[PDB]
Design an enzyme around this catalytic site. Structure first.
Site, PDB file in Angstrom:
ATOM      1  N   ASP A 394       0.718  -1.029  -0.109  1.00  0.00           N
ATOM      2  CA  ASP A 394       0.004  -0.036   0.014  1.00  0.00           C
ATOM      3  C   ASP A 394       0.688   1.266  -0.073  1.00  0.00           C
ATOM      4  OD1 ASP A 394      -2.034  -1.847   0.157  1.00  0.00           O
ATOM      5  OD2 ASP A 394      -2.665  -1.478   2.172  1.00  0.00           O
ATOM      6  N   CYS A 428      -1.992   2.571 -13.269  1.00  0.00           N
ATOM      7  CA  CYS A 428      -1.842   2.434 -11.658  1.00  0.00           C
ATOM      8  C   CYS A 428      -3.054   3.075 -11.068  1.00  0.00           C
ATOM      9  CB  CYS A 428      -0.260   3.216 -11.250  1.00  0.00           C
ATOM     10  SG  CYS A 428      -0.401   3.621  -9.625  1.00  0.00           S
ATOM     11  N   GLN A 475       7.844   8.904  -8.474  1.00  0.00           N
ATOM     12  CA  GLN A 475       7.339  10.036  -7.563  1.00  0.00           C
ATOM     13  C   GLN A 475       8.454  10.146  -6.326  1.00  0.00           C
ATOM     14  OE1 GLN A 475       3.800  11.960  -7.284  1.00  0.00           O
ATOM     15  NE2 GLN A 475       5.196  12.135  -9.005  1.00  0.00           N
TER      16      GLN A 475
END
Ligand SMILES: N[C@@H]1c2ccccc2OC12CCN(c1cnc3c(N4CCCc5ncccc54)n[nH]c3n1)CC2
EC number: 3.1.3.48
Length: 494
Positions: A394, A428, A475
């Site tokens: 997660d 995604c 990211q």
């Protein structure tokens, strides 16, 4: 196009002092979060006070506390400089950026590099125009600028630090090392005998031989008593050069087709559907062969009202493979709408007809053999293989790249086996974080596939090249290290 408002070495207390003494109301700056590493902070000044708004990023996007979610800090900052409100309803004003004078994040700044280590790098890696700036040892507090010209030679110029201002022994006196460099790039120094010290581009010290990936990962991991942070943050500073237009995404009739309001696709690389809009960009690897080159389509997780547009793109682009790196739900939040039928079932998504031919289950991923065809047209059917990775954490990235590599190795072999296969669709949640890490890792090992262990790779240069085609590919820094870990592991299994 500036990113000087980001302070990489400042604490929260140092930010309050900078804003109160050297700034005014409306001034703002960004910095890494010290109390919560991996996060960031936006320090804004209001009515003589300083506010600290948090910015979190676990791999999907930059989430501004009380604000919106953005693909990059530059995109976040640009969005508000042209309403950000506190959680009490008060409006925030991002008016005057407080420029940072720290040169740590500069491409040409190499810290405490030695003169011998510098001359070595400038001789074996540099060309005409390569330059670099290092800290001086014989004159503490000063710096040294070394430029290569040429038959060829290396020239050394001293940078003196006097009363917090820098100069090259004469001429103007600059407030920061960065200002001095830019000035002498536009107005290069010239020696009396004609030699012009042209600062063309900074010396490349990130390109490595694929074989020495392990020894390069060891270096970037050392304790100060880390290089990864320097290499990564130096790349993040370069994102202010990738503010391409995103008009079509901002159009009123396309707002509800974006999963995240501000994470929009670039106009010059977006997929035009031949009612033409979808949050997706073509990723065509460009670098400085007899096999067809592989391209990608980085896109978002399907929304209920974009599934029809998704299959139109897959059919239009002739894509035969789809890479899904997220569950339908993660932490009780929807990340991607089911756009495929149940096994053995047949559904119609507008004019497109899809049949789930078969599902093969592993622990890390599920594979679905889908048969795509245009309704009312017989000679349009083709097979589409959906690889659905389900074991991505997660938050953060996997501790070991093992599963991801076996996953991408199968994805690569299915694509190579289908003649005339179009781009590989990789999606995604927002389609920038995980989707960027996979595409970057795939591009990097494909280079090794075709040239061998003895070839040159440049992780930062590759990421930058991909970021100019979709906002914020890759990211966080954790995904950055994970990219190096992946390329390193893949090489050890050969
Ligand atoms: N300033 C850092 C530092 C601080 C202290 C001591 C030494 C030290 O070196 C620095 C500078 C040298 N190096 C680099 C160099 N280039 C990049 C880079 N880009 C961005 C897009 C354009 C590009 N084109 C080609 C290659 C790379 C890149 N991303 N990251 C990078 N890192 C390591 C970090």
């Amino acid at each position: 196009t500036s990113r000087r408002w980001f302070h990489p070495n400042i604490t929260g207390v140092e930010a309050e002092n900078l804003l109160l003494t050297r700034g005014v109301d409306g001034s703002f700056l960004a910095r890494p979060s010290k109390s919560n590493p991996g996060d960031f902070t936006l320090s804004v000044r209001r009515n003589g006070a300083v506010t600290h708004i948090k910015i979190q990023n676990t791999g999907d996007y930059y989430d501004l506390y009380g604000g919106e979610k953005f693909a990059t800090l530059a995109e976040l900052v640009q969005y508000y400089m042209e309403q950000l409100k506190e959680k009490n309803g008060d409006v925030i004003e991002l008016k005057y950026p407080l420029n940072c004078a720290d040169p740590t994040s500069e491409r040409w700044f190499h810290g405490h590099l030695s003169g011998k280590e510098a001359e070595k790098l400038l001789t074996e890696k540099g060309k005409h125009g390569s330059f670099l700036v290092r800290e001086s040892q014989s004159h503490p507090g000063d710096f040294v600028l070394s430029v290569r010209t040429g038959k060829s030679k290396v020239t050394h110029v001293m940078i003196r630090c006097q009363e917090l201002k820098y100069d090259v022994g004469g001429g103007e006196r600059f407030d920061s090392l960065t200002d001095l460099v830019e000035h002498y790039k536009k107005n290069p120094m010239v020696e009396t005998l004609g030699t012009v010290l042209q600062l063309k581009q900074p010396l490349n010290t990130t390109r490595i031989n694929a074989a020495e990936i392990e020894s390069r990962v060891r270096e970037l991991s050392k304790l100060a008593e880390q290089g990864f942070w320097e290499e990564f943050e130096t790349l993040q500073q370069q994102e202010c050069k990738l503010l391409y237009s995103r008009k079509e995404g901002q159009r009123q009739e396309n707002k509800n087709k974006n999963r995240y309001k501000n994470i929009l696709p670039f106009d010059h690389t977006r997929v035009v559907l031949h009612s033409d809009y979808i949050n997706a960009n073509i990723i065509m690897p460009e670098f400085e062969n007899s096999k067809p080159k592989k391209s990608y389509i980085a896109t978002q997780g399907c929304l209920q009202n974009t599934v029809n547009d998704f299959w139109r793109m897959v059919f239009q682009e002739n894509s035969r493979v789809i890479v899904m790196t997220t569950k339908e739900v993660e932490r009780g939040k929807s990340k991607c709408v089911k756009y495929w039928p149940d096994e053995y079932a047949l559904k119609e998504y507008g004019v497109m007809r899809v049949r789930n031919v078969k599902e093969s289950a592993a622990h890390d991923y599920t594979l679905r053999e889908l048969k795509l065809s245009k309704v009312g047209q017989g000679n349009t059917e083709r097979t589409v293989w959906q690889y659905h990775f389900r074991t991505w954490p997660d938050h953060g990235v996997p501790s070991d790249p093992g599963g991801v590599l076996d996953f991408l190795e199968e994805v690569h072999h299915k694509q190579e086996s289908i003649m005339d296969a179009g781009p590989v669709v990789v999606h995604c949640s927002a389609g920038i974080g995980r989707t960027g890490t996979f595409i970057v890792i795939d591009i990097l090992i494909d280079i090794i596939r075709e040239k061998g262990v003895d070839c040159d790779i440049d992780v930062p240069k590759t990421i930058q090249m991909v970021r100019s085609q979709r906002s914020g590919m890759v990211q966080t820094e954790a995904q950055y290290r994970f990219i190096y870990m992946a390329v390193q592991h893949y090489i050890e299994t050969l």
